[PDB]
């Protein structure tokens, strides 16, 4: 069996990932241009976090990489809407007066705000064979990664923009065949006065999950999923024949529920 | 009339079937799924390791006949990729950064037909 | 352990009946009408074909049998190759092929392979260490047949080969080895002394054909085979007789020497024009890949034209003692001699794209990056244009203004992101943004 | 061929890239057949061999029928409804009164 985490996270205007020219990294989807965060950036920011390291054959070598093959799988963070890069015109100042009101430096930097969709995958069999039959430590490191990935962000240009946002929707599912839900945002999300950017993204995710539940995923095997938003801020498919098996309003409760499903450990 | 061929749907947001002409820090790609790539996908789906693949599984599965139909060509998108930034790199070691540029296919879909033995 | 290459199966071939094989040299000369050279690295393919061309030149010189088009094989070459068995010899003392006197400078045998990292080269794409991995004898001959065309500078006290930095290499193509040889057949005046003879005491102002086309810029002496059980880390073939070390020595190239490879491309000053690819996209360079457009001016201006044919166009790019990239591209041509203004403009496409990307909408000077989002869509449009390189070069169905439409669809999607408002003014700036077409200038 | 959103157009000529088949009679491949280098043997010391590959094309509609998209839409917040004639509300108001 396989565990899959889908994540919706809006960010304040910043530049969390750059390239050789300073522009935010982008990609192409749905016929339009979307903002992107490269997968290795997310994996590095998760791995080298001090709070993560102070929390938990080594558990990081078992989960991540160094034939030791990692059970972790981080996909590129596509955006659920058309990218909107912007230029900020900065001017440096001199504290010493001169013959004119010169600057000292003149230039332009780039920034962009986006609502990213993140996909994660953990192979339970590879994880338990990596630690030679141990299960409690496997559940412990799964929970540690869940808290870390829920409470971390890249450090790119964070001394000037400080985009320390938090996720607004998490969906943890158990199934065999790996399918991601990037096809939900093939149509880019366009805002309306009666909703938010996060609300419409979560609703479109719910619509895609409903459509695929009515389709391929027959009664061969049930699919167990858990949906989390802080203090039940956003519902994924209100009623809708219980598209999500649970609705959670605290990170600890979701971590405990996933742990109790995977092994019943606490 | 038992079935004799298997169909693969290869469609994702980002795809990269690497080509033979990379050989260096310019990781290129091919326009279509290569035979070795889909063979490795099959062997990973069957739980066969790299060492175990070279004895019987790859010679057995190399006799099939393969054809790929293009549903969406996709767009080739590059990615600046640094390794070992703020950390040392292997070979003793060195405090240095490795630069590379990877290539992916974006918004592409392929259909793979692999005709062979019904079993 | 002698391992004569005339009888041992070392060259990897593919038969036109779909059967791959690993065959010898005599069999290659016998069935050059029904085989093709099978090598993943284009560099290895080019240098192997160069070695077969050199052997054909020597065989024609000493047998006086000129090869004919659309023929299986010029006869009596195989007995003549058999009369010289003692020369093309590997380890076992005596005369040794492409192998000079042993010395004290000992390096790992992977020194002569560019792709495999060694000697403070970072290992991230091939996990190996020096004096731990080994090479089979076929890969040893493959590495030995690389110095005169694909060597680079070293550190302090080590220079480069007879070609200075490795330039572009251009030559013709066919459907099989015999047709390839016949299409690429061109005898010279001064054959000279080939390096497999042994007498390297040239000391002459003029360099002969076989003297220079086999001009090894290093003195090497590879060691004896070592028993073991591993796989060669260049081809992966499971073998037990792996060699693990060699000895090297640098032979400096004397200045005031004239030697022109009849497959290369030179600048206006004869400065060994090199493929200009990188991986950084700096101020003076914008990454667009596939540097095929550069050497089709100098090669198509001095005796490199045969009207019809297929251009093979091996491209190896490096900067000082650091290999960057290697690629290849065939180009189909029929003739149709054209002017030089469009040829010169097409040959300078690298700086035309860099002017497109580096154009901002504000008043800063040249210390700027311009619009970086154009640089992301430039490689795809360049690759899509590159499908018709023959028509672009011959200018019979393609043109610069014909190719400007390929950016038109790509630039429509970028404008929706740079000017995302729904006002009239934003629509106007989006309309002006699609007009950004590259300008040819030299 | 499965279609995305209703406005989206479709490619008109679909290229197929297929392995060349000798048939034991046409022992020599045509000149358009090109060599790709993706026939594997091992993976840890990765080894490949070439193969002759040909490229043909298909016409959509004649060869592949365009499939129809599943029931889906862009998510919109529920604008509710409105109906008083409804008898259930006509009795709910009586209960309230
Ligand atoms: Zn080898």
PDB file of N, CA and C in Angstrom, chain C residues 14-18 20 22 33-34 36-40 45 126 175 231-232 235-237, chain D residues 20 22 27-31 33-35 37 39 42 44-52:
ATOM      1  N   UNK C  14      26.098  -2.957 -35.330  1.00  0.00           N
ATOM      2  CA  UNK C  14      24.711  -3.370 -35.496  1.00  0.00           C
ATOM      3  C   UNK C  14      24.504  -3.771 -36.952  1.00  0.00           C
ATOM      4  N   UNK C  15      23.909  -4.939 -37.160  1.00  0.00           N
ATOM      5  CA  UNK C  15      23.609  -5.414 -38.499  1.00  0.00           C
ATOM      6  C   UNK C  15      22.253  -4.883 -38.938  1.00  0.00           C
ATOM      7  N   UNK C  16      22.096  -4.710 -40.251  1.00  0.00           N
ATOM      8  CA  UNK C  16      20.853  -4.166 -40.785  1.00  0.00           C
ATOM      9  C   UNK C  16      19.688  -5.141 -40.687  1.00  0.00           C
ATOM     10  N   UNK C  17      19.942  -6.399 -40.326  1.00  0.00           N
ATOM     11  CA  UNK C  17      18.889  -7.353 -40.016  1.00  0.00           C
ATOM     12  C   UNK C  17      18.461  -7.292 -38.552  1.00  0.00           C
ATOM     13  N   UNK C  18      18.808  -6.217 -37.847  1.00  0.00           N
ATOM     14  CA  UNK C  18      18.393  -6.033 -36.471  1.00  0.00           C
ATOM     15  C   UNK C  18      19.200  -6.783 -35.438  1.00  0.00           C
ATOM     16  N   UNK C  20      22.405  -6.989 -33.200  1.00  0.00           N
ATOM     17  CA  UNK C  20      23.641  -6.366 -32.716  1.00  0.00           C
ATOM     18  C   UNK C  20      24.732  -7.405 -32.513  1.00  0.00           C
ATOM     19  N   UNK C  22      29.300  -7.821 -31.371  1.00  0.00           N
ATOM     20  CA  UNK C  22      30.613  -7.291 -31.020  1.00  0.00           C
ATOM     21  C   UNK C  22      31.635  -8.065 -31.841  1.00  0.00           C
ATOM     22  N   UNK C  33      29.564  -3.322 -45.953  1.00  0.00           N
ATOM     23  CA  UNK C  33      28.361  -3.064 -46.733  1.00  0.00           C
ATOM     24  C   UNK C  33      27.090  -3.515 -46.026  1.00  0.00           C
ATOM     25  N   UNK C  34      27.201  -4.191 -44.878  1.00  0.00           N
ATOM     26  CA  UNK C  34      26.029  -4.720 -44.192  1.00  0.00           C
ATOM     27  C   UNK C  34      26.113  -4.521 -42.682  1.00  0.00           C
ATOM     28  N   UNK C  36      26.666  -1.249 -39.349  1.00  0.00           N
ATOM     29  CA  UNK C  36      26.842   0.131 -38.927  1.00  0.00           C
ATOM     30  C   UNK C  36      27.520   0.154 -37.566  1.00  0.00           C
ATOM     31  N   UNK C  37      28.284   1.216 -37.320  1.00  0.00           N
ATOM     32  CA  UNK C  37      28.947   1.373 -36.033  1.00  0.00           C
ATOM     33  C   UNK C  37      27.932   1.782 -34.974  1.00  0.00           C
ATOM     34  N   UNK C  38      27.903   1.044 -33.870  1.00  0.00           N
ATOM     35  CA  UNK C  38      26.914   1.235 -32.813  1.00  0.00           C
ATOM     36  C   UNK C  38      27.625   1.734 -31.561  1.00  0.00           C
ATOM     37  N   UNK C  39      27.555   3.042 -31.325  1.00  0.00           N
ATOM     38  CA  UNK C  39      28.145   3.642 -30.138  1.00  0.00           C
ATOM     39  C   UNK C  39      27.199   4.707 -29.610  1.00  0.00           C
ATOM     40  N   UNK C  40      26.956   4.687 -28.298  1.00  0.00           N
ATOM     41  CA  UNK C  40      26.061   5.670 -27.696  1.00  0.00           C
ATOM     42  C   UNK C  40      26.671   7.064 -27.736  1.00  0.00           C
ATOM     43  N   UNK C  45      31.858   7.214 -31.783  1.00  0.00           N
ATOM     44  CA  UNK C  45      31.506   6.881 -33.160  1.00  0.00           C
ATOM     45  C   UNK C  45      32.388   7.631 -34.148  1.00  0.00           C
ATOM     46  N   UNK C 126      28.254   9.554 -12.020  1.00  0.00           N
ATOM     47  CA  UNK C 126      28.845   8.224 -12.136  1.00  0.00           C
ATOM     48  C   UNK C 126      29.630   7.963 -10.858  1.00  0.00           C
ATOM     49  N   UNK C 175      24.151   5.125 -45.172  1.00  0.00           N
ATOM     50  CA  UNK C 175      23.347   4.079 -44.555  1.00  0.00           C
ATOM     51  C   UNK C 175      24.166   2.886 -44.082  1.00  0.00           C
ATOM     52  N   UNK C 231      32.354  -5.218 -13.616  1.00  0.00           N
ATOM     53  CA  UNK C 231      31.865  -4.772 -14.911  1.00  0.00           C
ATOM     54  C   UNK C 231      32.553  -3.468 -15.284  1.00  0.00           C
ATOM     55  N   UNK C 232      32.849  -3.310 -16.572  1.00  0.00           N
ATOM     56  CA  UNK C 232      33.495  -2.098 -17.053  1.00  0.00           C
ATOM     57  C   UNK C 232      32.554  -0.909 -16.919  1.00  0.00           C
ATOM     58  N   UNK C 235      30.654   0.532 -20.463  1.00  0.00           N
ATOM     59  CA  UNK C 235      29.711  -0.230 -21.265  1.00  0.00           C
ATOM     60  C   UNK C 235      28.915  -1.250 -20.469  1.00  0.00           C
ATOM     61  N   UNK C 236      29.370  -1.648 -19.284  1.00  0.00           N
ATOM     62  CA  UNK C 236      28.612  -2.538 -18.431  1.00  0.00           C
ATOM     63  C   UNK C 236      28.684  -4.005 -18.782  1.00  0.00           C
ATOM     64  N   UNK C 237      29.506  -4.389 -19.749  1.00  0.00           N
ATOM     65  CA  UNK C 237      29.608  -5.794 -20.125  1.00  0.00           C
ATOM     66  C   UNK C 237      30.301  -6.582 -19.018  1.00  0.00           C
TER      67      UNK C 237
ATOM     68  N   UNK D  20      10.658  -1.145 -35.848  1.00  0.00           N
ATOM     69  CA  UNK D  20      10.704  -1.713 -37.188  1.00  0.00           C
ATOM     70  C   UNK D  20      10.636  -3.232 -37.111  1.00  0.00           C
ATOM     71  N   UNK D  22      11.129  -6.735 -39.251  1.00  0.00           N
ATOM     72  CA  UNK D  22      11.696  -7.276 -40.495  1.00  0.00           C
ATOM     73  C   UNK D  22      10.707  -8.117 -41.289  1.00  0.00           C
ATOM     74  N   UNK D  27      14.530  -8.051 -45.280  1.00  0.00           N
ATOM     75  CA  UNK D  27      15.604  -8.139 -44.297  1.00  0.00           C
ATOM     76  C   UNK D  27      16.327  -6.815 -44.088  1.00  0.00           C
ATOM     77  N   UNK D  28      16.239  -5.888 -45.036  1.00  0.00           N
ATOM     78  CA  UNK D  28      16.928  -4.608 -44.944  1.00  0.00           C
ATOM     79  C   UNK D  28      15.911  -3.494 -44.735  1.00  0.00           C
ATOM     80  N   UNK D  29      16.134  -2.688 -43.699  1.00  0.00           N
ATOM     81  CA  UNK D  29      15.207  -1.631 -43.337  1.00  0.00           C
ATOM     82  C   UNK D  29      15.253  -0.493 -44.356  1.00  0.00           C
ATOM     83  N   UNK D  30      14.172   0.277 -44.472  1.00  0.00           N
ATOM     84  CA  UNK D  30      14.200   1.468 -45.328  1.00  0.00           C
ATOM     85  C   UNK D  30      15.137   2.530 -44.771  1.00  0.00           C
ATOM     86  N   UNK D  31      15.417   3.525 -45.614  1.00  0.00           N
ATOM     87  CA  UNK D  31      16.373   4.562 -45.248  1.00  0.00           C
ATOM     88  C   UNK D  31      15.803   5.561 -44.251  1.00  0.00           C
ATOM     89  N   UNK D  33      14.291   4.639 -41.532  1.00  0.00           N
ATOM     90  CA  UNK D  33      14.440   4.040 -40.215  1.00  0.00           C
ATOM     91  C   UNK D  33      15.675   4.601 -39.526  1.00  0.00           C
ATOM     92  N   UNK D  34      15.498   5.063 -38.290  1.00  0.00           N
ATOM     93  CA  UNK D  34      16.545   5.731 -37.535  1.00  0.00           C
ATOM     94  C   UNK D  34      16.882   4.913 -36.298  1.00  0.00           C
ATOM     95  N   UNK D  35      18.132   5.015 -35.864  1.00  0.00           N
ATOM     96  CA  UNK D  35      18.637   4.232 -34.745  1.00  0.00           C
ATOM     97  C   UNK D  35      18.422   5.010 -33.455  1.00  0.00           C
ATOM     98  N   UNK D  37      18.951   4.277 -29.101  1.00  0.00           N
ATOM     99  CA  UNK D  37      19.900   3.494 -28.315  1.00  0.00           C
ATOM    100  C   UNK D  37      19.306   3.049 -26.986  1.00  0.00           C
ATOM    101  N   UNK D  39      17.914  -0.198 -26.021  1.00  0.00           N
ATOM    102  CA  UNK D  39      17.647  -1.601 -25.732  1.00  0.00           C
ATOM    103  C   UNK D  39      18.473  -2.003 -24.516  1.00  0.00           C
ATOM    104  N   UNK D  42      21.323  -4.334 -18.464  1.00  0.00           N
ATOM    105  CA  UNK D  42      21.417  -4.240 -17.017  1.00  0.00           C
ATOM    106  C   UNK D  42      21.048  -2.828 -16.585  1.00  0.00           C
ATOM    107  N   UNK D  44      22.462  -1.621 -13.075  1.00  0.00           N
ATOM    108  CA  UNK D  44      23.465  -1.114 -12.146  1.00  0.00           C
ATOM    109  C   UNK D  44      24.748  -0.745 -12.902  1.00  0.00           C
ATOM    110  N   UNK D  45      25.316  -1.603 -13.758  1.00  0.00           N
ATOM    111  CA  UNK D  45      26.191  -1.100 -14.821  1.00  0.00           C
ATOM    112  C   UNK D  45      25.404  -0.893 -16.103  1.00  0.00           C
ATOM    113  N   UNK D  46      24.715   0.241 -16.254  1.00  0.00           N
ATOM    114  CA  UNK D  46      23.697   0.366 -17.310  1.00  0.00           C
ATOM    115  C   UNK D  46      24.278   0.175 -18.705  1.00  0.00           C
ATOM    116  N   UNK D  47      23.654  -0.721 -19.469  1.00  0.00           N
ATOM    117  CA  UNK D  47      24.122  -1.096 -20.796  1.00  0.00           C
ATOM    118  C   UNK D  47      22.958  -1.077 -21.773  1.00  0.00           C
ATOM    119  N   UNK D  48      23.171  -0.446 -22.928  1.00  0.00           N
ATOM    120  CA  UNK D  48      22.154  -0.326 -23.960  1.00  0.00           C
ATOM    121  C   UNK D  48      22.731  -0.718 -25.315  1.00  0.00           C
ATOM    122  N   UNK D  49      21.835  -1.121 -26.209  1.00  0.00           N
ATOM    123  CA  UNK D  49      22.123  -1.472 -27.589  1.00  0.00           C
ATOM    124  C   UNK D  49      21.129  -0.774 -28.504  1.00  0.00           C
ATOM    125  N   UNK D  50      21.514  -0.504 -29.750  1.00  0.00           N
ATOM    126  CA  UNK D  50      20.634   0.228 -30.661  1.00  0.00           C
ATOM    127  C   UNK D  50      19.504  -0.637 -31.207  1.00  0.00           C
ATOM    128  N   UNK D  51      18.549   0.042 -31.838  1.00  0.00           N
ATOM    129  CA  UNK D  51      17.411  -0.607 -32.476  1.00  0.00           C
ATOM    130  C   UNK D  51      16.861   0.321 -33.549  1.00  0.00           C
ATOM    131  N   UNK D  52      16.329  -0.278 -34.614  1.00  0.00           N
ATOM    132  CA  UNK D  52      15.791   0.475 -35.742  1.00  0.00           C
ATOM    133  C   UNK D  52      14.338   0.837 -35.462  1.00  0.00           C
TER     134      UNK D  52
END
